[PDB]
Structure 1
Amino acid sequence: TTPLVHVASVEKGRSYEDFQKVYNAIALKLREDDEYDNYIGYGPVLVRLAWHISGTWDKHDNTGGSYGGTYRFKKEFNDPSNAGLQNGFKFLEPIHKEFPWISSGDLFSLGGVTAVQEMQGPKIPWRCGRVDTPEDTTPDNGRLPDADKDAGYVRTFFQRLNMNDREVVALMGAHALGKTHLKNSGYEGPGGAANNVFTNEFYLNLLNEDWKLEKNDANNEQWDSKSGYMMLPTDYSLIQDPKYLSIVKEYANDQDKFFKDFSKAFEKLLENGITFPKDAPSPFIFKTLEEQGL
């Protein structure tokens, strides 16, 4: 009977300018509450939030993904590995009250796109049409990756997301942003010196810094450097696997290459599990607050 089909249906009478305003609402609030997490901002946690809801997708049965926008219910926002994402949720709620018409799925995914652009990252094409589904469509626990693992688990996990080595290494560039919170995931510290700015520093720090495997106060093991940075085991595995290493080395030299690859891979991640109609409008490219004079 085939896996279920999710068709993208645009909100009634809504067009580009309407979604550009939602962008501006999120892009303003980022500049507005800048005190979050010791002045890191809500930027990184919104990128993870877009990744977390889209990381529930299973290509085999087409279950999960950003379509349903079912991230709101007791089952999936109370998990162990989503800890700290409630802050990203509370962030988008006053904005959703402003635009009650927009779907939860489109709001979350856009919130990820908005954050990356306003952090001076690459332009990420964004499509609408995600439809909110009843609570019976909510996925189960454990469809998101464990941080303590090797390169094999990483490659294996992302196959379920239909992501290849090229796309997964690009996507990991986002771990240069924000930090790990011991109170949340059981790991502590940032990955580099620029948390709120989108850069290729992730790949640079990975092979440039000297890493030592130590124990944090949660008794978990992470790779720490003298500069005070940190790397998850799944992150350090990218220079462990020779195939992953060459791509790490490449993004370190070419940031522009990294930006273009990330943009496609991130959009694909956000668009996984959606069937776009032929009459659907071309992907929106949103204007940053910097281009609007702000």
Structure 2
Amino acid sequence: GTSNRDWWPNQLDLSILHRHSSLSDPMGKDFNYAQAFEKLDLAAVKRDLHALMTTSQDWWPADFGHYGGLFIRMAWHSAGTYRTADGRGGAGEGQQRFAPLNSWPDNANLDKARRLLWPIKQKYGRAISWADLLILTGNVALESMGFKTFGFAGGRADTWEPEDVYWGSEKIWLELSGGPNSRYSGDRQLENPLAAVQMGLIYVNPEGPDGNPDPVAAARDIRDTFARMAMNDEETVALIAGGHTFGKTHGAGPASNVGAEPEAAGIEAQGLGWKSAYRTGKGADAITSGLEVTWTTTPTQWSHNFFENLFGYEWELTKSPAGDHQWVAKGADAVIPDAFDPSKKHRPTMLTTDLSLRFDPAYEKISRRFHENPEQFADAFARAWFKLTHRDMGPRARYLGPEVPAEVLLWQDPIPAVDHPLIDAADAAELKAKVLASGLTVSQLVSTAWAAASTFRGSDKRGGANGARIRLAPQKDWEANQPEQLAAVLETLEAIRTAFNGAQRGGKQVSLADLIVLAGCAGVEQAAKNAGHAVTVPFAPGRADASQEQTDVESMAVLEPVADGFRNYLKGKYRVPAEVLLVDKAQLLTLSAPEMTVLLGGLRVLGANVGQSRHGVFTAREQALTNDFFVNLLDMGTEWKPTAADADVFEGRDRATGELKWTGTRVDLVFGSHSQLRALAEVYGSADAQEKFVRDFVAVWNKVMNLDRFDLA
């Protein structure tokens, strides 16, 4: 069937904003996963998982009699798709069970692992999500094998459809770099927001870059990809060596024996894939990656044998039975156990990427320290394993259950506890009036609260106005945030704050984070008053102020908005058209198309544009909350043409006289061009729509202000 995407393959796609409807969700609209999970008997779940570890099924026999290595790999791949650039990927939505991830080559045979878990999932039902179960099972595998984990939090609710993620533009699985859709340019520069070297890999190629078995060059790719998953050198070494303490790779025969991935397989495969013609197709004959490496002498027990082997041998380049590059220990004895024949042993073996940990000079120093001090290795690995598996969960307020680590970690963007009474409705009224009486304008108030709140992304639940991190490095100096203007606003609000807090009794105080939001609420009310309309904007107190010492500045950099169409802002020129970037930002804000539309039309007339640009300010009553953006954009009396100077800036002239009325960007004008967005603009631009426009603007402003308010969840 030919589709709109076939005919107009470059038209903007709004369907990413309308996923996750109540239509596709099998749970009722009142289901609350946290409420379910809080009553789960987590101990019982863990005892069933522990038993599973050594209960082999004949359709996918357990290596060494123990599924622990398979389950560790499963959980590491569940988490391992995460990119810090956008927050997308990660284990937090259980997306490994859907396309495309369920059928990535790097996820081969994890269909088997998830199938092994169906009995437990079935037993406990809605009280444990697949998302949570995949991570838990990796923890229980680690515990079963003698490794002490750092902890575990539940609360990842299941999803019901694939997420819309850009995983790259290649049309061939695993394509090597330098093709027509290459994700590399320049001197091996991986395109943002990608965090993997080839389409369908988690991070890097285990043979080496584009298959070249050089451990030093492989180290470069490990470092870059892991940094793009928010891990530093110590964490990276700890994770790789920790993982590879357990289990084995699978490459018993040629890869041409392996059939279709799950999304391509026949209906009778019942959701499994990679069926193999090689001998038994499983167990001793399994083929997963094509590599055939077993790292340690006790693949089912925590040890410090990975580093003992890595440093205790010299390594020779060899080939697996599938023809893939791997390494074997020179002159070694057969000391590694076979996975099924108790009378066979094997020489130590390594991947190219394992040897990176000894041949890259910076990794070698960490690896030596870990070899000499295995306690330090165990602690780093437990910490890194927790971070890997929790990095996309969001604020600690979302962590559920009895095994949550009490230690607050800097990567969590921690928010201090509130230990004092909160302002009430009358206090909030008093503060809104004090803010308006200070002389701060509607545009200042709206712009400041927008800047604070709109760092939130729903991909990994980072950002938002809680913390008042807008007053700290680096947010206070981001271009989009207009650093000098911002500092002036913040000084005025901090003086209101000090005067209000100094007058209270009883311990009551207001945080700066709450006052920033409240002040933006005052600005929105005042703009509505300026248009002739009395409205109250909802506000919920309870935000707290984080310190600079509780803020990792380097980690906060990925939250900078380099394109923010809601402020008509683009920090530089990108290949992706600005309208596409607006829909991307709206998805990370969790907005629907109607919410995006209302919000942007209102922001334009409120004065939220960076630099007070007139682009899209289609009103003669700026700082009044009216639907003038939509009425004026849709007026057929105005003709639009791209300027000579800049093809992405447009002049709006009266069609009869030629007189200049307005200017706009692509982000403004898309609302008059895209057929679905124009239809939305028409509802807000109609003569009956002033009340609707105000109410729906107030609703979406409050939604944005509350995106990180999981303390009210």
TM-score range, shorter chain: 0.7 to 0.9
Kindly provide the CA deviation profile for residues 155-187 of structure 1, in whole angstroms up to 9, marking residues without a partner as x: 111011100011011111211211110111011
Q: What residue in structure 1 maps to residue 49 of structure 2? A: 26
The amino acid of 2:119's aligned partner reads P
SS at match of 2:220: helix
Partner residue in 2 for 1:142: 200
Map 1:152-171; keep pairs closer than 5 Å: 152-171=220-239
Whether 2:298 is the aligned partner of 1:194: answer yes
For 1:110, the equivalent position in structure 2 comes to 136
TM-score normalized with structure 1 length:
0.88
SS in 2 for 1:222: strand
The answer to whether residue 215 in structure 2 is matched with residue 215 in structure 1 is: no
Instruction: Please give the secondary structure, in 1, of the residue aligned with 2:48.
Output: helix
- Are residues 197 and 270 of structure 1, via their aligned partners in 2, closer, same or farther at CA, if it must alter by over 3 Å? same
Deviation of 1:217 (Å) = 2.3
Contact 2:54 2:65 in 1 (8 A): no
2:369 — aligned with what?
Answer: 250
Counterpart pick for 1:262 among 362, 369, 381: 381
- The amino acid of 2:373's aligned partner reads D
Please state whether the residue corresponding to 2:357 is helix, strand or coil: coil
Paired letter, 1:144? I
Using the TM superposition, give the Cα deviation of residue 253 of structure 1 relative to its aligned residue in structure 2, in angstroms: 1.7
Distance 1:217 1:260 in 2: 36
Residue 420 of structure 2 corresponds to none
Q: Report whether the alignment pairs 1:89 with 2:193.
A: no
Which range moved further: 128-137 or 32-41? 32-41
Q: Deviations over 1:26-50 (max 9, x none)?
A: 0111133398344241100000000
Aligned-partner Cα distance in 1 for 2:164–2:378 = 33
Per-residue deviation, residues 69-120 of structure 1 (Å, max 9, x unmatched): 0211242122211112122111111110011111111000001111001100
- Equivalent residue of 1:180, what SS? coil
TM-score (normalised: structure 2): 0.37
Structure 1 residue 284, shift from structure 2 partner: 0.5
Cα distance change on mapping 1:72 and 1:281 into 2, 3 Å: closer
Matches within 5 A, 1:33-112: 33=56, 36-101=61-126, 102-112=128-138
CA deviation string 1:56-77 (max 9, x = no partner): 1111111111111021124212
Q: Is the 8 A contact 2:54 2:62 kept in 1?
A: no
In structure 1, distance between residues paired with 2:382 and 2:358:
22
Equivalent residue number for residue 151 of structure 1: 219
Structure 1, 241-250 or 220-229: larger mean CA deviation: 220-229
Q: Give the superposition deviation at 1:272.
A: 1.5
> Which amino acid is 2:319 matched to?
K
- Looking at structure 2, the residues matched to 34 and 116 of structure 1 have their Cα atoms a distance apart, in angstroms, of 20
Aligned length in residues: 279
Percent of aligned pairs with the same amino acid: 30
- The farther-off stretch of 164-173 and 225-234 is 225-234
- Structure 1 distance, partners of 2:320, 2:73, is 22
- One-letter code aligned to 1:104: W
Q: Is the 8 A contact 1:23 1:114 kept in 2?
A: yes
Q: 1:34–1:40: 8 Å Cα contact kept in structure 2?
A: no
Letter in 2 for 1:175: H
Which 4+ runs in 1 deviate beyond 6 A? none
Q: Does the CA contact (< 8 Å) of 1:76 and 1:138 recur in 2?
A: no
- 1:234 equivalent among 342, 346, 353: 353
Matched residues in 1 for 2:41 and 2:148: separation?
A: 22
Partner Cα distance (1:16, 1:169) in 2: 37
Q: Is the 8 A contact 1:40 1:195 kept in 2?
A: no
- Given candidates 128, 132, 135, the residue that maps to 2:158 is 132
Taking the aligned partners of 2:112 and 2:238, their CA distance within structure 1 comes to 25
Aligned to 2:394: 275
- Output the CA distance in 2 between the equivalents of 1:186 and 1:204: 25
**Higher relative contact order by CA 8 Å / sep ≥ 6: 1 or 2?**
1
How far residue 279 of structure 1 moved from its aligned partner, in angstroms, is 6.9
Give the drift of 1:16.
Answer: 7.8
**Once the two structures are superposed, what CA deviation does each residue of 1:169-213 show, in whole Å capped at 9, x if it has no partner?**
111121121111011101113012110111221111101022111
Q: Secondary structure at the match of 1:278?
A: helix
Preserved CA contact (<8 Å) 2:105 2:201: no
> Could you say which structure has the larger radius of gyration?
2
